[PDB]
Amino acid sequence: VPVQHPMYIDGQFVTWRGDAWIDVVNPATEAVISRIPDGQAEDARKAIDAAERAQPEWEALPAIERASWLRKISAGIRERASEISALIVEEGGKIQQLAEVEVAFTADYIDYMAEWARRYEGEIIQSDRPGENILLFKRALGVTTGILPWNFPFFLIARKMAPALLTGNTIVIKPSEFTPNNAIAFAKIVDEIGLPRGVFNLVLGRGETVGQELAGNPKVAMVSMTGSVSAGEKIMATAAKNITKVCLELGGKAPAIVMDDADLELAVKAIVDSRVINSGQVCNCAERVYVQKGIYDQFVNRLGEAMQAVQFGNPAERNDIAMGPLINAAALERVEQKVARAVEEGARVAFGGKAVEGKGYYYPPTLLLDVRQEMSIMHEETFGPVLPVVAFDTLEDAISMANDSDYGLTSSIYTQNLNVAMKAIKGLKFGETYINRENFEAMQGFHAGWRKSGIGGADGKHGLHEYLQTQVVYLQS
Amino acid sequence: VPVQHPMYIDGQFVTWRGDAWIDVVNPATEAVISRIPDGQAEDARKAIDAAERAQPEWEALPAIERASWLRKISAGIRERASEISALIVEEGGKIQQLAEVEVAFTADYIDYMAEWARRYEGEIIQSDRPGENILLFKRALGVTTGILPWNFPFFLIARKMAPALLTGNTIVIKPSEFTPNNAIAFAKIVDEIGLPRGVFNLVLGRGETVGQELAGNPKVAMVSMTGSVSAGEKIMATAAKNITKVCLELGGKAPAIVMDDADLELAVKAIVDSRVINSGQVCNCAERVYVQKGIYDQFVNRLGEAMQAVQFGNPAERNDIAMGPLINAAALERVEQKVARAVEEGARVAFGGKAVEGKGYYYPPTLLLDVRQEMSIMHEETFGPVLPVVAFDTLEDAISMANDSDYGLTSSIYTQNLNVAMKAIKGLKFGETYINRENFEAMQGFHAGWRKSGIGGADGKHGLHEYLQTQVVYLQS
Amino acid sequence: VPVQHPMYIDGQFVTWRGDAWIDVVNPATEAVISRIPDGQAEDARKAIDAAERAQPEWEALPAIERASWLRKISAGIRERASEISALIVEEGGKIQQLAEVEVAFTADYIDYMAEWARRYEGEIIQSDRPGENILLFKRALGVTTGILPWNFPFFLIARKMAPALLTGNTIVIKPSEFTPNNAIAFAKIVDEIGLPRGVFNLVLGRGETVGQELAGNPKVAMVSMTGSVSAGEKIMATAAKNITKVCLELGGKAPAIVMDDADLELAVKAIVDSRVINSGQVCNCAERVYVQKGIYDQFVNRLGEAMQAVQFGNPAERNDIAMGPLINAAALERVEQKVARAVEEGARVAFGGKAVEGKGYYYPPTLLLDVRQEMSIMHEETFGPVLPVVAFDTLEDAISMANDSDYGLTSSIYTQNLNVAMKAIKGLKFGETYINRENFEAMQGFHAGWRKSGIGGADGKHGLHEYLQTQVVYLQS
Amino acid sequence: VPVQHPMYIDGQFVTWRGDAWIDVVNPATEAVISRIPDGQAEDARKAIDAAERAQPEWEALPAIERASWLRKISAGIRERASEISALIVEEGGKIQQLAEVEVAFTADYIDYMAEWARRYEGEIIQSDRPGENILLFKRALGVTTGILPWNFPFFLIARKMAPALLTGNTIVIKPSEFTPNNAIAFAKIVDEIGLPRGVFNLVLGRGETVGQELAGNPKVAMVSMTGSVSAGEKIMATAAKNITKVCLELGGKAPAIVMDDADLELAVKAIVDSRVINSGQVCNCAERVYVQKGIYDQFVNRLGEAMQAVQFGNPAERNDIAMGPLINAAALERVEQKVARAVEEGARVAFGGKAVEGKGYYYPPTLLLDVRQEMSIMHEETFGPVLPVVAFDTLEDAISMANDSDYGLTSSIYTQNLNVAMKAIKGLKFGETYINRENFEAMQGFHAGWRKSGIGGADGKHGLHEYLQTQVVYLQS
Ligand SMILES: NC(=O)C1=CN([C@@H]2O[C@H](COP(=O)(O)OP(=O)(O)OC[C@H]3O[C@@H](n4cnc5c(N)ncnc54)[C@H](O)[C@@H]3O)[C@@H](O)[C@H]2O)C=CC1
Ligand SMILES: NC(=O)C1=CN([C@@H]2O[C@H](COP(=O)(O)OP(=O)(O)OC[C@H]3O[C@@H](n4cnc5c(N)ncnc54)[C@H](O)[C@@H]3O)[C@@H](O)[C@H]2O)C=CC1
Ligand SMILES: NC(=O)C1=CN([C@@H]2O[C@H](COP(=O)(O)OP(=O)(O)OC[C@H]3O[C@@H](n4cnc5c(N)ncnc54)[C@H](O)[C@@H]3O)[C@@H](O)[C@H]2O)C=CC1
């Protein structure tokens, strides 16, 4: 338009009266597709205060009724699927096929979470005291907040708000300043179906301003955020002031282990069909590939051939490409610098390794060989489509190198030996380990990272429980 | 002696080579009973590095074997019970009877926790994918740290190390600089029974130095601490730098609600026999008493009479007193100032209200009437034996005032009406609610505070789980 | 028609070739509404063999896919709701309003059960052996059977088949010979949506013949049945021959306790609005009323007035009545005999007590006073609308008399005292206890009777688990 | 002596006044070692009535106090370990080493079970009704009974009474008429430590008499039994009369699968060191050995050599033998007949195959080759040390043949391929599957058989739950 978006506070869209706006750009063409308010703490406070006023009534509603509200939202999403998918493609730069999957998955995820209504249980504990009953109830936290990243922006809205609402909490969400459009569409659905005012709020702005208020406001019981480790650190430090609970997912460096006795065809496909599910921008797919000698040569060749076939370009104009552009300028620059450094350190460029120059932010699928566990490229989130390869002799070497990281969210291994599999599972220090398949968490699993990958977690029963707290009642006589 | 204590690092006692020492004083006589090293970050690092080296081997041990080690420690504690009780009395200032209970309870707690060995379960989750198994294993965090307060110093050692060790973690503990003696005795038992080196480490020093290193060191998977909200804030802020998990218990202002239809005798006894279980220094017993009109006069009189009978003095020389001295000078001063402020604001002194002057730090049982929810005494941890009383008309008023606090750890109510009880339980926003009995958490319950009272929790199954993290394995075909 | 119904075996309706048929009559008019085959063991065997052939493929399907099939069935039911409700009214004799509720509830129940797909969990247990993993998987039983009663005939189909199918089992169902029509309609929906052949089978006939084969066939992993204790005994005895698992619900004599401090209005309404939800033919609503002296007179009068307003008649022609006819002739006769015996024993008829003579099987709402715990009417399922009332002095007397029964499925009490409630809960020996409300189990609860009321149970997580068995895997190294 | 044993009823030993006695013989020498009363139903009734009188008070005791009682019993057992081991050796015919293990294991098992005291949980379920709480409590069944077999006679006492007592139930136990001595010693310990009268009762006699009364008495909430499928059938049929819950373990035909890629050394040792842990009389060790072609010849030879080294004889006079005598004459006879039949059918005797003639009941380790899945020896519990071997080509053949049995308690497989292991686990229809190790259930697992192997189960959390039933409370407002 470029359309100027309003925030969603206390059951209604509120037109921004400030003079400062933030431009939302299309990563493929660099053109301005929309504008959002340069929100400030006060805007966050209004949303938080509204969420607080609505929380008692919301938690008082039988759980099945909150589930009913969630189902109305998912149904609204499916009705506007193509519209929302296009928004994601346009601002996030991901290929049409993946955007479509994200939208459909988000709706299914919400429905799945709504099913917890009559299932989350409190407990009755035996007491040492005659005639006493120890009742442990599961209560809502109260007001919660969600801070979202640019990757899987739409899904992450649901990943936080669905469990939050189901358990009786209210929420205030802030999407990334780079991908707010899909979030506005989510708010419109919430508004259209009539969700009780204050239960779901959407605030817009930067991390340093709005994000910080969502983390530091004393009325917030828990702050949930997904994205960079740097932002997570600032969020937690701020939450500390009020002893506010934090729920963080800060990505990492997913390592992949390919053994000699591994199904070469399966391994290569799993690694490329994972590093491709979002222009090589996801936090679950192998960013560190370890291949042992015995099969090294064969593996590197097939993998090299697979990456050559990977075409990049504008997602909106090409439905036959496997990769879109990077989110923004800084992202592209950091990729270049890291690849260059790697090369200077001794890394062998088997493919790509040269940034494209022109409209949008494109970087060619890059394959690096003769890489050393020591090199900085093995200890720095490379955003773009860069695959560093490291050879090894024994399982212990591979497991040891994979564990050698400040991140511990996702891992994977390919082999056919029972002992090797059980050994890798026991030795790998990660929240997730994929065996002979591609990386992608199920809604009923538990996406939780070790070390700097995060705190708490998301999805399944355990993800739902992050939004609940206990009240232990000692009923005497 | 005054004996000069060494630290316990990597399976052996290490003599302090520094020139700076911290004097440990007897709160009843102000005499120096011992001295501990003015530990520094480097000392904490040595302990942490030792804990890291021992962790893999320790976690590799079958759980029942770790339990066996824990049982040896509890047995060592019971053998030295009277010796340890005296240490607690001497440095903590608590009465002989309570010290004895703390020691016996600590041993039982350790045994109870050891019983979790073959019981904590991982899970097997149904997958949407044909032939796939989703295995969710429960793994240890790795290296953990514990920072302890002066109240219930001995028990708190076990409250953190027992669950930690059982689940395969190693630990580094720092007792409060005011009550380290009981902790040294704990370390001697660990050393005598031969616990594998590095699994249990004891470092000595101040919070700003040693404590901060236990919270900020990158090798620490989780930092556990009990004490003041101010220290908890600094601990969490520091942990944020490395996205380190935190487990905090920061006390509060336990409110008590006395209804008209309440067993007057029971209520009064429960409130005084709780505010007395540690010279009125515990974080679970009523520090805010709400009494409704109908029974106000009767209740205040019986309560006043009960408090007059409360004798204070040196725990070591008197086994017939209900109260000992406050932990230190600053503690005593803060109590005076808060009582004085309360009075100036309109508070009516029905008993006590005047600090004692002489050796040690004694403050008389104080009863304040005509107090207003507004007054600062209702929003500030009063350490000493001060009981503020506030009258009310309806249950809703009492519940509303009790919830009006930045703390939400413990609560209580006295009544005989089914509807009133269920209403109080549903309305009270606390981690714990005691009905018609005194405040004291069971080892099988879950001591976890709401709002600023903390993060995570302790005791029972949920306390044990704080020391475990998940590893989700997607086994395809 | 009277239409002649076929059975549903191995994915298709099979026309009966036998010469013997069973007439299905309308309890209100005694007219023949339909006819079903006088099935024999061989027919059951064909269904069981078909279920066996389909089970491996069915269990092999991801759980969410089985859930998808279940959702198609519930959706089919809602589409034909009015049609099915009429069938129930016509053959079961229940009032239009209750039939409608049963149908809608059945559909919601199926959807609720389908939600367990990704939720039922296996477990990972710590081993005493180094390097060993103990994996406990939840597997299907295989082929299961369901034998249904005439009360809530439609719902009971789902209560057994929904959990059975969800967990990977196949099933063969036999409805009561008195109420098979609603079951045929259920089979048509299964056939129309295309459920894989053999997964759901419907056989028709008597208990002694078809029912016995469903209990005694060696290929059946578990036999599930709801109805009379006499039939349950024969079913279990037969299952014993092959050590076949049994799941039984055999009704009982639900006792109700009315205290002096009880909300008289609430109590009376709860007792009449429960004894009315199916012409006084349900197995959950008070069939034994205990009222204490203090409020006796008041209670008996209000209750007497409430029962006078209860009109009986043909459900199909009257949508303003609270009661329909009894299921059959024998049922009516047994009611008469029991009321008469009661009277001869000293029972005081305060209302009704005289069977109606003419078309259909009607019995007037009957109120009996001055009844003694001793009388046989207190130890015999009275089918019809008969309410025996017994006075008592203390809570202990009431609890003791309520427990004095071979049945222990459902119970209830009305009071406002916290102590009384907790005392009743602790003292009452029943699978269910309702406090200050009417009797009706939630889908997320657990309907399981004590003593002769049954074995195993239905509904919620525990009901779902009845259809699962464990496979413990000891994976060494 | 031969000593004449009294029963243990209502807290005291009761001298038998009947004229009929049953001789207890030493299976190695056929000499009379003791005599027990030929108990009758009335004796069982006295015990059951006593158990009923004590149950309310026992369940009323806090769970930890019941655990304390259990710990006193285990401690009493360890004090008399050698004495009890000798009793088992003498009457059961098992080798000294295994008897010692059984006694020590029994004591550890009791302690393990006592640890459930503060751990078994009830649940709090979300309701669809505003202001309603659904409380699911775990209650005791009441009076339970245990009927024991001759194998692992001592352990089985604890396997039933430990979980029973811990959860608040009382119990009446009847040991096998062939091995009652160890049970009398158990009763003496119970009497000496002072367990409340009626909680633990011991009755003596035959199955047809005393056993039947323990299964058919209306006051019994659940009957638990381990032994032959024939007796289990009679027990369940009788329990049916009162809809009495049953808990059965009826042995079976444990199959073992040896793949070509299997650790030959490990497999052979696991099979012989399992079939030897009780003179080849256990219900968990391979009684059906399936070996594939590729490794057949090698495996059969090593296995043949291992069995030759197996020496048999009097356990009391030889502490260097791997096998004792069979329990009784009928047992020996049935083994002969089955081996002979097998031979006539085409079975090739590679070793043994000829019954010993003289004092006691000895049968030589027998190895049968060229056996066919069809042969009756593959479908009949062979008691003695007979190992039938069957060759196969593919995994599917082995899995299919193993599943081809009316029993489904225990199974095992030896291989090194990840896919093979996961395939065997998924394909094998048994309550237990051992991979690359010998057969022996852990106390924290769940010993539960599929098909005719039983109903319900024992050990771990699930075994404990068999002794608990639910009480669902719907607390409105
Ligand atoms: N926001 C900006 O002005 C600029 C961002 N970038 C790049 O954008 C990328 C976005 O990465 P993501 O994976 O989304 O992770 P991220 O952590 O940078 O952002 C995720 C979410 O956290 C918020 N956030 C950032 N800092 C925060 C703070 N201090 N307190 C509270 N919230 C905060 C963001 O606004 C967003 O909603 C980064 O790699 C960064 O280098 C580059 C130039 C400028
Ligand atoms: N079936 C008949 O020929 C007659 C039945 N009745 C009455 O019908 C009533 C029906 O009561 P419900 O609450 O439905 O309980 P119920 O136990 O009599 O019937 C419930 C279900 O169990 C089956 N069943 C009955 N006996 C069986 C057996 N021995 N083995 C296997 N299955 C068996 C039935 O066919 C039905 O599907 C009884 O009160 C009875 O007196 C009266 C006269 C005849
Ligand atoms: N009891 C006897 O008079 C004789 C027994 N035997 C042999 O003794 C063996 C013992 O085998 P186990 O593995 O112990 O299994 P089992 O089932 O024969 O005995 C286990 C337990 O069940 C009891 N029992 C047996 N029949 C029962 C019934 N109908 N009702 C209630 N309880 C009953 C027994 O008394 C014992 O306590 C059998 O193989 C049998 O052939 C041989 C000749 C006589």
JSON list of C-alpha atoms in Angstrom, two decimals, chain D residues 219-277:
[
{"chain": "D", "resi": 219, "resn": "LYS", "atom": "CA", "xyz": [-15.43, -60.63, 51.37]},
{"chain": "D", "resi": 220, "resn": "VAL", "atom": "CA", "xyz": [-12.36, -60.87, 49.12]},
{"chain": "D", "resi": 221, "resn": "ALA", "atom": "CA", "xyz": [-11.85, -57.78, 46.90]},
{"chain": "D", "resi": 222, "resn": "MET", "atom": "CA", "xyz": [-9.12, -59.45, 44.81]},
{"chain": "D", "resi": 223, "resn": "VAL", "atom": "CA", "xyz": [-7.52, -62.86, 44.44]},
{"chain": "D", "resi": 224, "resn": "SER", "atom": "CA", "xyz": [-3.89, -63.03, 43.31]},
{"chain": "D", "resi": 225, "resn": "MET", "atom": "CA", "xyz": [-2.30, -66.22, 42.04]},
{"chain": "D", "resi": 226, "resn": "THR", "atom": "CA", "xyz": [0.80, -67.51, 40.30]},
{"chain": "D", "resi": 227, "resn": "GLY", "atom": "CA", "xyz": [1.20, -71.00, 38.80]},
{"chain": "D", "resi": 228, "resn": "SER", "atom": "CA", "xyz": [-0.45, -73.31, 36.23]},
{"chain": "D", "resi": 229, "resn": "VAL", "atom": "CA", "xyz": [-2.96, -72.13, 33.64]},
{"chain": "D", "resi": 230, "resn": "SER", "atom": "CA", "xyz": [-5.32, -74.93, 34.73]},
{"chain": "D", "resi": 231, "resn": "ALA", "atom": "CA", "xyz": [-5.49, -73.66, 38.31]},
{"chain": "D", "resi": 232, "resn": "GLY", "atom": "CA", "xyz": [-5.77, -70.05, 37.13]},
{"chain": "D", "resi": 233, "resn": "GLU", "atom": "CA", "xyz": [-8.84, -71.01, 35.10]},
{"chain": "D", "resi": 234, "resn": "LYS", "atom": "CA", "xyz": [-10.54, -72.59, 38.11]},
{"chain": "D", "resi": 235, "resn": "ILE", "atom": "CA", "xyz": [-9.64, -69.59, 40.26]},
{"chain": "D", "resi": 236, "resn": "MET", "atom": "CA", "xyz": [-11.07, -67.06, 37.82]},
{"chain": "D", "resi": 237, "resn": "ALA", "atom": "CA", "xyz": [-14.22, -69.09, 37.20]},
{"chain": "D", "resi": 238, "resn": "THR", "atom": "CA", "xyz": [-14.85, -69.18, 40.95]},
{"chain": "D", "resi": 239, "resn": "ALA", "atom": "CA", "xyz": [-14.07, -65.48, 41.39]},
{"chain": "D", "resi": 240, "resn": "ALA", "atom": "CA", "xyz": [-16.72, -64.78, 38.74]},
{"chain": "D", "resi": 241, "resn": "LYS", "atom": "CA", "xyz": [-19.51, -65.77, 41.17]},
{"chain": "D", "resi": 242, "resn": "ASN", "atom": "CA", "xyz": [-18.87, -62.57, 43.15]},
{"chain": "D", "resi": 243, "resn": "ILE", "atom": "CA", "xyz": [-17.35, -60.47, 40.37]},
{"chain": "D", "resi": 244, "resn": "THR", "atom": "CA", "xyz": [-14.08, -60.68, 42.32]},
{"chain": "D", "resi": 245, "resn": "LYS", "atom": "CA", "xyz": [-11.05, -59.02, 40.76]},
{"chain": "D", "resi": 246, "resn": "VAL", "atom": "CA", "xyz": [-8.31, -61.43, 39.67]},
{"chain": "D", "resi": 247, "resn": "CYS", "atom": "CA", "xyz": [-4.54, -61.03, 39.32]},
{"chain": "D", "resi": 248, "resn": "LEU", "atom": "CA", "xyz": [-2.95, -63.99, 37.54]},
{"chain": "D", "resi": 249, "resn": "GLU", "atom": "CA", "xyz": [0.46, -65.10, 36.30]},
{"chain": "D", "resi": 250, "resn": "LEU", "atom": "CA", "xyz": [0.29, -68.50, 34.60]},
{"chain": "D", "resi": 251, "resn": "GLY", "atom": "CA", "xyz": [3.78, -69.07, 33.13]},
{"chain": "D", "resi": 252, "resn": "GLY", "atom": "CA", "xyz": [4.17, -70.16, 29.51]},
{"chain": "D", "resi": 253, "resn": "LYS", "atom": "CA", "xyz": [6.74, -71.09, 26.83]},
{"chain": "D", "resi": 254, "resn": "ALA", "atom": "CA", "xyz": [9.40, -68.32, 26.61]},
{"chain": "D", "resi": 255, "resn": "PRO", "atom": "CA", "xyz": [10.82, -68.27, 23.07]},
{"chain": "D", "resi": 256, "resn": "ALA", "atom": "CA", "xyz": [14.40, -67.23, 22.22]},
{"chain": "D", "resi": 257, "resn": "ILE", "atom": "CA", "xyz": [15.53, -65.94, 18.81]},
{"chain": "D", "resi": 258, "resn": "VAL", "atom": "CA", "xyz": [19.18, -66.28, 17.74]},
{"chain": "D", "resi": 259, "resn": "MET", "atom": "CA", "xyz": [20.09, -64.37, 14.55]},
{"chain": "D", "resi": 260, "resn": "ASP", "atom": "CA", "xyz": [23.14, -65.05, 12.36]},
{"chain": "D", "resi": 261, "resn": "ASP", "atom": "CA", "xyz": [24.74, -61.72, 13.29]},
{"chain": "D", "resi": 262, "resn": "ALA", "atom": "CA", "xyz": [24.38, -62.60, 16.97]},
{"chain": "D", "resi": 263, "resn": "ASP", "atom": "CA", "xyz": [27.14, -62.75, 19.56]},
{"chain": "D", "resi": 264, "resn": "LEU", "atom": "CA", "xyz": [27.31, -66.56, 19.69]},
{"chain": "D", "resi": 265, "resn": "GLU", "atom": "CA", "xyz": [29.15, -66.60, 23.03]},
{"chain": "D", "resi": 266, "resn": "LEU", "atom": "CA", "xyz": [26.67, -64.23, 24.69]},
{"chain": "D", "resi": 267, "resn": "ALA", "atom": "CA", "xyz": [23.60, -66.05, 23.32]},
{"chain": "D", "resi": 268, "resn": "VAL", "atom": "CA", "xyz": [24.68, -69.52, 24.50]},
{"chain": "D", "resi": 269, "resn": "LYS", "atom": "CA", "xyz": [25.61, -68.28, 27.97]},
{"chain": "D", "resi": 270, "resn": "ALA", "atom": "CA", "xyz": [22.37, -66.31, 28.29]},
{"chain": "D", "resi": 271, "resn": "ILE", "atom": "CA", "xyz": [20.29, -69.37, 27.36]},
{"chain": "D", "resi": 272, "resn": "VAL", "atom": "CA", "xyz": [22.08, -71.86, 29.64]},
{"chain": "D", "resi": 273, "resn": "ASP", "atom": "CA", "xyz": [22.62, -69.45, 32.56]},
{"chain": "D", "resi": 274, "resn": "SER", "atom": "CA", "xyz": [18.87, -68.80, 32.45]},
{"chain": "D", "resi": 275, "resn": "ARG", "atom": "CA", "xyz": [17.63, -72.37, 31.99]},
{"chain": "D", "resi": 276, "resn": "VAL", "atom": "CA", "xyz": [19.90, -73.20, 34.93]},
{"chain": "D", "resi": 277, "resn": "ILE", "atom": "CA", "xyz": [18.68, -70.58, 37.43]}
]
